[PDB]
């Protein structure tokens with residue numbers, strides 16, 4: 001679990017969005033595993049606007065943060081799950097690191113701010129949904 005709170009927006013994994021997220025929907029994209037909902041309170045986070053390919057992510061299944069080198073956002077095949085059929089997930093960045101299903105929502109940050117959230121994993125890999133291209137989150 002986990003979310004990004006920026007301005008009057010809450011960014012979560014689309015597959016973990018609640019009834020309240022859907023009732024306050026701003027934007028969603030199944031191909032990216034992202035959903036953004038509106039909030040009444042001002043949020044705590046800053047979004048990175050950069051091309052960093054190193055950062056640190058929070059891994060809830062270890063209660064620890066890990067440094068990672070990750071690939072640039074790209075279209076990656078993701079096997080079928082209870083949430084989605086087998087498909088290509090876009091804007092996804094991979095890195096070597098530990099990740100279990102409940103780790104989705106953990107934040108990846110670089111020195112400039114929030115880069116993305118954990119969205120996939122397995123076999124010593126961790127995948128992050130990028131949010132750096134969503135410029136409207138800042139306005």
Ligand SMILES: NC(=O)[C@H]1CCCN(C(=O)Cc2ccnc(O)c2Br)C1
Pocket residue numbers: 015033078081083084089099100101102103104119120121122123
């Ligand atoms: N399609 C998706 O973005 C995910 C939806 C939930 C399922 N999914 C995963 O990758 C689940 C996952 C996450 C983290 N570490 C793991 O070892 C595993 Br398996 C795929």
Ligand SMILES: [Zn+2]
Pocket residue numbers: 048049050051052110111112113
């Ligand atoms: Zn950066």
